[PDB]
């Protein structure tokens, strides 16, 4: 908070009088069925000291979720988004750096909750031919209650060096109609991984047993669209004033086959068996300010 | 957040300094039943890198909910929509791409709770003729408790290309009168799929046997009215200046029908039976800045 | 949201840098009770496309919530507010379009909560002769909630077409004296329809057994007030400037009467008994800008 | 608040009508992997008192959680990040002064709910052989409840002197795969430490058997990017223009190692076995408002 | 309010198109390890009728939390940091006078809540000799729960007088390690004061048993930064135009020692046991319009 | 709210484009401990009607919450703040008069809860002896909770006359030490008024057996310190131009104490024992924009 420090809001930013001159660059890429775009601006603030370009790799990554292969009535696959990744690098000679970087790790919380519960109890019992009966008790009780939020798919914030910074958005858990939350490595010895199951014992086709795309979450069919702002500084002294950075937006899937065994559908996921990758190159011309690729 | 990463508020932002010439198109398909309305509006930023132009696709689909057939008191009919679609789309040879498009498929959360708890108990019974009892006792409890919030119709963006964006509203499922949610593959094998349905073994005649559409949501009687953004950039110094866009309204309705058996109604789902599209072609004039069809 | 597309906020509005000529009309229909009133506003902006007038048919409609018959000491009858309705209309030989309207459908959601309890016991009990007993015993527990907000009264937005467009709210369900939720459609094999009783088997006349005003919903009584925005764009180069709309204002009524069997009150409800309706025309003068009537 | 002196806010914020001459300084220490960066801001206004300059070390520090050591099957090490720490330093012979610090130690609160509950019961037992019974009881319920919330890591500002000033994030309590919250201290006569560990008495290989790091914390194994700022005040009469300032960086990580005593996983922690510090000297020269090193 | 009157927000507020002359004033204590500054702001309103001076002694007080005495395996004590104090005092001759100060003591509520609760039971039991056996039962119950939120440390704003104005900031209870709060006064016959105890019958050390600083507050360990205005109004008549202030940043210190009597620790907590005072002298040359010491 | 009217936001207040001579005057009574503060505003809008001036009596009253009188270690006396006012009046001769007044009555609501249950039972019990049981049982509950939040402390505006307007703060009720609410009529038969006890059968002196006042409410010990503000208009045709007020903040405190019995402390209290009035009179003058005394 800027105005905590006694300092008046607003004052240490940095973009005051001056022209931005922004930019676009669509492209899709039907193989792997990525619709990537950055946005970039050139901010150069005299009161600054280095020029800035901001990149955001707004972007769209499909979902990919369908069933690759099926044999027979007995066993089906299925091959589904595990995690989304999106990352930039520059070239180890060059001259400009990474800033910032807006979305980033944060700590995550939980509540908690302490119980104690004393008790007395007391009582008259009797009958027709004159019974008169007794009984005092107590008890005690001791409860421990803790209590979170997950989401279903978990953004976090690799380690950026200097010269490249990525994001990773990976699948924490589902919950399957209702049932509790199953995640990859969830496994039950009857039923087996049952995260994207429809019916436990089903007498339908392999390739039919499984969850409704709508049913599950909308990021493994549909696909998710990421938000990320990167900020590059390059000294305003240098030689050479171009600039080439590396766009990558690569897709990890995993397969998951359910079995009949016998009499129930047993199933198994195999984590990591498939990566897409999309990378570009951009080059970067400071003195111009613009981007184009 | 523009302000976490220490520039000022709004800087990166386009459309200062300029004239945005806006407008407005609505026609009205009565064989479809779909208000259909488009609002553009064209921003030329001199400081940004190509031609802007954002298309608000706010129209107004129908709901259709009514019986469609009846034969006798046994057995009727129900036609209600499934899904609302609104999707535009590019001709393969044109020039103009697909940027950005705000309704975006966003993570859900759910929260998760875990309970433990110890007892302790003891009592000391008497009666008239002198015997004492006693009595010492202990217990655990492990719980564990997930909760999440679902809405009646979850809205999708499907995987956008290049050159066509789509989003998608359906039908996740409805309360019927207080009792547990039901949809549309919820089965009992003694009633059925119970949806839409008054009584279970009301007396009344079948087409009359059906739930108020007053009663169940809104989006099924009275329709859906989308709010949906799209913005498309084109190069400025491109040969061609005039661009056709195609807007569809398509929806989906399924047939629910009940039947009465012996004692009891029982209801019956049949998904995607019709499907009612309205396509229109716009024509983008660049050098002009206006849309007309 | 405007600023989610990387768009300057407020750049895509319109009604920048222009003069706007507002107005009102007032008008009070004393045979139905409704004050009535529109409150238009003309908006020519140069940068878009067509004439605009948004419309706001404020007003006030009445409840009347009273007994209109009573025959002795053995019945009595009600009439109250079942639905209020207010609808715009437009000519079919005319040009003007309706455009757009505020308050429409929206999704509404429920939420949900799963419980799963693991138990486990063990007592010891003993007496003076120096019986010894054991107990161990184990039990478990799965529950389902689900909760949900209903209001009282329900507003709903009717199919827009190109030239008419209508509002309507409609009685969802009432609580009657800390009693459950009670609807136009409930039903006691006993008692009946106990939605406006006061006392199930009171000794009093038939027209003072029944729920006071004040303590039922305050649109019962004291009417309902709408606030409902409507836009009408019309080409600036239509050959006749002159349009005319139609306002109505029709409110429904039910007919709830309580009948003294043998010991008890029943209450029976009749829908849709009365209807009221106020119909008035307006003319608008584009070139004038000015609505007059 | 300001306001609530009857003083107009923003009146006494300092800043106003005056240019700041801001910078950034961007370094990344490959040996500790820690992507160190600062954020300047030369404030010199006329109506103030001293010449400022506020310092944000943003930067970025790794987490490095990871397996160091296996032997054979039968015990495997862990190290990771028990601790982050950034701090800064003056020269004892430096004039400049150490004035604001904005994140602070901050009080927290907690709820309680005190509850009490009275009692009464009776019942009325028959049989066929007309034997009456009666039983007339009463109990009493005392319960204590409180409840908190609790981070996983927890910021902390170290007490400031004059010359230095730093912050500290340590590792509250972790919860294991919905277990209860585990911290350093915690131990089990039979299993020890569970902080991280995947399964009691798992079958597989010592190395193998550790939480997955998407499942724990994001800061454990993708580290923590702080964000901290502090401001250091000049005399505008110094005789000497030039300071020079001290940033570290420096990380703890701890010692997990379980080991597979005859049956089930036995895990040991060992704190603070490791420091990874990072220390650079910046140079500000205030007659030239500028940073640099 | 101020729009709650009617009066247009701001009008009444001070410090409208006038020059307000800040300062600050840093300085360390080290004897008593209190890094105290004040930040001063001159405002003379021509349309207000006395000279204005708003005082804001943010600085910073260590916690100072420790073992100070140790004897042995058997004995051993501890200083922790009991309340935090600072006061502004003026010259009993002096003519400036105290107006305002910001955090001030607020009335605090609570929840409060009551149950009733009515029950029927009936059970049929049988045997496979035909006897057959019923009850029939009822029972209540009321229940009182009242639930409220109490901080760690309490700030309270001691009475002000026309020249001296001071606040002050105590211990109200701390949670040792999940268990019920504990407070200074607590006394428990076995164990005693139980509020920096580690173990209840550990083994170690009595040095060794003590509450981890990281587990206990934030303030005990690395202190109590505070943040409070005041305001001194000077007559702009008066004859002599400078004023002395003296500022004080006391802190309380208390003994908790725990003793090893025959099996268990035992604690006792001795309050008020140290005060460190760190009075200056501030002078105030309104004519000038700065504060220098 | 002015936006619900269709009426441009802030347009019908008053202070525009006009010039506020506000003011300060500040008073301590030493005899009473009560640092009264008034601050003035003179608002002469000429597009109004009447010249106004809005008085806020900050100010502070001290608490006195001490023990006045012991006698022995048998029975000892305590004087506690009951109730803070602080009141204005107008000479009844005077021509300006009270317009309006901030701090106002507000409706207080309250939660309510029905709930209901149905259940069904039914075991089956079998011995080694081949004997069989069964039993079959059901059972029905009903409950209310109503739930509501009550201060320590309400405030309360006496009913304003056109020449005098007054406010009150009472005290509502109290929890001690965790122990249910108590109020000043609170009565037990064993022990009496518990509000301000410290042990109920404590050996210590009388007059060391009361709750610390750092315990009890701030407003108890520390004082309450108003925030009120009144608005007095005057004709600007009056022939005279001076104005009289009178600024009352008188306090009242009840007389609470404990005497020991024959084995347990026994509480008594005496309310509106005492009251300290401190009223001052100012002098207003209208043509000088001046309140001076
Ligand atoms: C896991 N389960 C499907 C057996 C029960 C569902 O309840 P929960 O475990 O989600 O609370
Ligand atoms: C599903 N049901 C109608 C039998 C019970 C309703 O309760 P719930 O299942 O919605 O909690
Ligand atoms: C419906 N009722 C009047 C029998 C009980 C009221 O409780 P609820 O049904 O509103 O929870
Ligand atoms: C600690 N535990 C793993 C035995 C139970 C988990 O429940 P909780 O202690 O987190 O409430
Ligand atoms: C006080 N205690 C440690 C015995 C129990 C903890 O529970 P609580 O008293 O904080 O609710
Ligand atoms: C009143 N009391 C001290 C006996 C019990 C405290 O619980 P509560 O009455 O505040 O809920």
Redesign the interface.
Same mark, same amino acid.
């Given at each position: 908070?800027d105005?905590?420090?006694?300092?008046?809001?607003?004052?240490?930013? *940095?973009?005051?009088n001056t022209?931005?001159?922004?930019?676009?660059?669509?492209? #899709?890429d039907?193989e792997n069925?990525m619709?990537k775009?950055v946005?970039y601006?050139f901010?150069d603030?005299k009161?600054?000291?280095?020029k800035?370009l901001?990149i955001?790799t707004?972007g769209?990554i499909?979902?990919q979720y369908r069933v690759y292969s099926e044999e027979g009535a007995n066993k089906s696959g299925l091959a589904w988004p595990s995690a989304f990744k999106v990352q930039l690098q520059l070239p180890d000679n060059e001259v400009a750096? *990474? @800033?910032?970087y #807006?979305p980033?790790? @944060?700590? =995550? &919380?939980?509540?908690?909750?302490? &119980?104690?519960? #004393?008790?007395?109890?007391?009582?008259?019992?009797?009958?027709?031919?004159?019974?008169?009966?007794?009984?005092?008790?107590?008890?005690?009780?001791?409860?421990?209650?803790?209590? #979170?939020?997950?989401?279903? $798919?978990?953004? *976090?914030?690799? @380690?950026?060096? =200097?010269?490249k910074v990525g994001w990773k958005v990976?699948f924490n858990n589902m919950?399957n109609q209702?049932w509790?939350?199953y995640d990859r490595?969830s496994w039950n010895p009857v039923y087996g991984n049952q995260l994207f199951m429809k019916t436990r014992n089903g007498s339908m086709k392999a390739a039919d047993n499984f969850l =409704?795309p709508?049913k599950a979450?909308?990021?493994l069919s @549909?696909? $998710?669209?990421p938000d990320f702002?990167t900020?590059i500084?390059m000294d305003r002294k240098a030689s050479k004033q171009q600039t080439n950075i590396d766009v990558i937006y690569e897709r990890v899937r995993d397969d998951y086959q359910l079995h009949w065994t016998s009499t129930n559908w047993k199933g198994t996921n195999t984590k990591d068996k498939w990566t897409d990758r999309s990378s570009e190159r951009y080059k970067i011309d400071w003195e111009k300010e613009?981007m184009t690729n």
């Open positions: 908070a105005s905590d420090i006694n300092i008046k809001t607003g004052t240490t930013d *940095i973009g005051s022209t931005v001159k922004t930019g676009d660059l669509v492209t #899709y039907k069925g619709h775009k946005f601006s901010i603030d009161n600054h000291n280095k800035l901001v955001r707004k769209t499909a979902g750096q *990474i @800033s910032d #807006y980033r790790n @944060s700590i =995550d &919380t939980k509540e908690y909750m302490s &119980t104690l519960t #004393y008790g007395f109890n007391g009582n008259v019992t009797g009958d027709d031919t004159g019974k008169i009966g007794g009984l005092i008790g107590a008890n005690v009780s001791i409860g421990h209650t803790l209590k #979170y939020v997950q989401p279903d $798919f978990k953004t *976090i914030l690799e @380690s950026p060096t =200097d010269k990976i919950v209702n509790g939350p490595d =409704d709508n979450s909308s990021l @549909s696909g $998710f669209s702002a900020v500084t613009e």
